[PDB]
Amino acid sequence: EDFLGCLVKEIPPRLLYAKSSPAYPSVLGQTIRNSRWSSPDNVKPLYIITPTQVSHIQSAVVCGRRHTVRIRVRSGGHDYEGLSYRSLQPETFAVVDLNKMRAVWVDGKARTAWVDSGAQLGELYYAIYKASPTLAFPAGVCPTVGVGGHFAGGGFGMLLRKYGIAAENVIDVKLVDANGKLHDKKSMGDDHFWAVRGGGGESFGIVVAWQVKLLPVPPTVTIFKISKTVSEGAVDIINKWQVVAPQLPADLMIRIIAQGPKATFEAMYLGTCKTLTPLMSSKFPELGMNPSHCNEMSWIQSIPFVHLGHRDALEDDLLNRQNSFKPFAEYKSDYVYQPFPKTVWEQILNTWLVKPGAGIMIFDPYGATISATPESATPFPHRKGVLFNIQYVNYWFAPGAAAAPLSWSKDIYNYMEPYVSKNPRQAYANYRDIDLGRNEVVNDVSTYASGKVWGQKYFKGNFERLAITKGKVDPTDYFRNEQSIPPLIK
Ligand SMILES: *Cc1cc2c(nc3c(=O)[nH]c(=O)nc-3n2C[C@H](O)[C@H](O)[C@H](O)COP(=O)(O)OP(=O)(O)OC[C@H]2O[C@@H](n3cnc4c(N)ncnc43)[C@H](O)[C@@H]2O)c(*)c1C
Ligand SMILES: [Br-]
Ligand SMILES: [Br-]
Ligand SMILES: [Br-]
Ligand SMILES: [Br-]
Ligand SMILES: [Br-]
Ligand SMILES: [Br-]
Ligand SMILES: [Br-]
Ligand SMILES: [Br-]
Ligand SMILES: [Br-]
Ligand SMILES: [Br-]
Ligand SMILES: [Br-]
Ligand SMILES: [Br-]
Ligand SMILES: [Br-]
Ligand SMILES: [Br-]
Ligand SMILES: [Br-]
Ligand SMILES: [Br-]
Ligand SMILES: [Br-]
Ligand SMILES: [Br-]
Ligand SMILES: [Br-]
Ligand SMILES: [Br-]
Ligand SMILES: [Br-]
Ligand SMILES: [Br-]
Ligand SMILES: [Br-]
Numbered sequence: 001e002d003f004l005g006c007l008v009k010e011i012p013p014r015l016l017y018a019k020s021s022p023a024y025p026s027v028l029g030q031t032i033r034n035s036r037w038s039s040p041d042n043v044k045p046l047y048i049i050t051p052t053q054v055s056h057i058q059s060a061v062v063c064g065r066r067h068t069v070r071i072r073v074r075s076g077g078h079d080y081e082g083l084s085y086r087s088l089q090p091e092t093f094a095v096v097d098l099n100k101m102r103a104v105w106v107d108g109k110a111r112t113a114w115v116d117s118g119a120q121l122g123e124l125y126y127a128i129y130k131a132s133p134t135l136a137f138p139a140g141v142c143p144t145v146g147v148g149g150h151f152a153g154g155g156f157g158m159l160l161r162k163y164g165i166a167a168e169n170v171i172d173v174k175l176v177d178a179n180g181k182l183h184d185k186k187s188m189g190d191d192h193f194w195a196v197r198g199g200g201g202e203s204f205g206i207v208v209a210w211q212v213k214l215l216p217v218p219p220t221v222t223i224f225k226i227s228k229t230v231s232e233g234a235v236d237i238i239n240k241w242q243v244v245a246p247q248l249p250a251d252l253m254i255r256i257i258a259q260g261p262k263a264t265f266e267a268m269y270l271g272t273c274k275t276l277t278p279l280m281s282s283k284f285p286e287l288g289m290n291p292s293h294c295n296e297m298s299w300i301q302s303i304p305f306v307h308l309g310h311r312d313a314l315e316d317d318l319l320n321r322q323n324s325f326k327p328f329a330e331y332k333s334d335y336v337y338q339p340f341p342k343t344v345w346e347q348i349l350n351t352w353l354v355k356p357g358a359g360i361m362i363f364d365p366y367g368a369t370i371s372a373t374p375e376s377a378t379p380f381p382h383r384k385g386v387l388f389n390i391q392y393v394n395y396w397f398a399p400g401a402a403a404a405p406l407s408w409s410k411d412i413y414n415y416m417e418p419y420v421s422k423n424p425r426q427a428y429a430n431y432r433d434i435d436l437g438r439n440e441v442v443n444d445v446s447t448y449a450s451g452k453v454w455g456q457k458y459f460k461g462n463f464e465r466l467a468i469t470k471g472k473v474d475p476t477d478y479f480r481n482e483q484s485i486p487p488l489i490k
């Protein structure tokens, strides 16, 4: 009653929910993306707060501090492990859900915008579009991903080779810290501002809004999706790709989707078919790309096209808060610095991707701008020398059929170990993977040593600076989860 008592004093009760409340279950599930985490055996928050004003957030944090109830913040709910709305083990926590704070204010001529953390990527992209056909912002591919978690974890998509990650294009934030104080860049100091942009969600306070710079794109971009089965010589072509793709011009990204003995080469080119074809002919003719393969469209139209395959449905695809896609999902990731021997590609395509419960593998090439940024200039370390990133995606759709796909994710990660990065085995923070390791808690504080185990995988040489920053802004580890930066102090 103590915490709840505090909340009602400053926050409109229509914005507060207890498990008792009749609307609680729908408020909880509304942005859950993973059916694994909605089943009733999952630990649920004691309370849910849905602020509409920043002062509501400040009040929630103050109350939380005063009555020692911890807060997990949720924006888009896409956390792979569900850590924005569940804990792994029993504990008492409130979720602050930001889905009602979703405004996007674009300043077209200044090429900047303020975006609320509760807005979804689709909404941010659309608002930029309404302002200018030739402005863009380099973030992820999924339109329902929340801005808050995405930017905090770094965030990258089809513009990553041109402009880098979403986080390194943030010029200001509005943040509520572990004491309910509201900061921006001017008032928070450098480590905190460095850490919050890429150092992972939750750990560095609740970001209310982000100011971004908007970047130029041509009025026309070109997409292609070219498939090659192993019969068509996939293994030979993908073997070339791993060396060529990272050093293609920054205007050209070619990623690979593979879900059987067949590679799909998905490309975004910031230019026309006219100029892409000779470039392909010159730099990667092994693909056999020709003008029939070109899809010219605006940058904004490329967003639903890349994720769905649709070309027609702009407002529907970018502005959607229905969420009927709640699969059971498991994810892992890897980084690759030196080329695979062609035999590994053969095993992947012919053997591993044809197993029971086998998943999907996505290959994003780096190099160019993302790899130009020094490794420590942001908390995101996977930069110079990276050929490509790998995501291992596993979907299933029935509650009892978990064992085989889980077993495949585990088995293929083991298989790949010799061929991917090591000491540490690097991983992408926004592809959250609890099997990389979790925090131990001693005297109600996350330990540095337990945090180090996964932390060096996500953040490499930047982990210690993140922990020191944490130590400065949240020494009592108020804002934490099972995989959040532990405070390092003396
Ligand atoms: C579901 C999904 C995820 C995707 C998809 N595609 C991606 C892509 O093309 N590029 C990427 O870089 N990442 C992609 N991902 C992963 C997402 O980027 C991550 O899953 C994001 O972390 C998701 O953000 P969000 O939807 O906001 O997730 P939440 O569960 O709300 O938060 C995650 C994490 O961060 C903390 N957090 C949330 N909100 C805040 C604020 N305002 N301030 C600080 N910290 C915050 C949460 O506590 C939690 O720990 C494609 C798809 C379909
Ligand atoms: Br109080
Ligand atoms: Br009210
Ligand atoms: Br209610
Ligand atoms: Br419930
Ligand atoms: Br709500
Ligand atoms: Br649900
Ligand atoms: Br998910
Ligand atoms: Br519970
Ligand atoms: Br406000
Ligand atoms: Br207060
Ligand atoms: Br107390
Ligand atoms: Br506490
Ligand atoms: Br567990
Ligand atoms: Br779990
Ligand atoms: Br735990
Ligand atoms: Br201006
Ligand atoms: Br602005
Ligand atoms: Br308009
Ligand atoms: Br995304
Ligand atoms: Br979607
Ligand atoms: Br800046
Ligand atoms: Br504000
Ligand atoms: Br304040």
Ligand SMILES: [Br-]
Binding pocket: 174, 182, 183, 184
């Ligand atoms: Br401020």
Ligand SMILES: [Br-]
Binding pocket: 185, 186
């Ligand atoms: Br400043």
Ligand SMILES: [Br-]
Binding pocket: 186, 187
């Ligand atoms: Br100031």
Ligand SMILES: [Br-]
Binding pocket: 188, 189, 190, 191, 192, 193, 469, 472, 473
């Ligand atoms: Br600081």
Ligand SMILES: [Br-]
Binding pocket: 149, 152, 153, 200, 201, 429, 430, 432
């Ligand atoms: Br994260």
Ligand SMILES: [Br-]
Binding pocket: 112, 171, 213
């Ligand atoms: Br700027």
Ligand SMILES: [Br-]
Binding pocket: 216, 217, 218
């Ligand atoms: Br341009």
Ligand SMILES: [Br-]
Binding pocket: 218, 219, 220, 271, 272
């Ligand atoms: Br053009």
Ligand SMILES: [Br-]
Binding pocket: 223, 224, 225, 295
């Ligand atoms: Br196509």
Ligand SMILES: [Br-]
Binding pocket: 225, 226, 227
């Ligand atoms: Br094809």
Ligand SMILES: [Br-]
Binding pocket: 230, 235, 346, 350
């Ligand atoms: Br082969």
Ligand SMILES: [Br-]
Binding pocket: 233, 236, 237, 286
């Ligand atoms: Br070839």
Ligand SMILES: [Br-]
Binding pocket: 242, 243, 338, 339
């Ligand atoms: Br190479």
Ligand SMILES: [Br-]
Binding pocket: 244, 247, 248, 249, 283
């Ligand atoms: Br080249």
Ligand SMILES: [Br-]
Binding pocket: 249, 250, 251, 252
């Ligand atoms: Br270029």
Ligand SMILES: [Br-]
Binding pocket: 273, 274, 275, 277, 291
């Ligand atoms: Br042409």
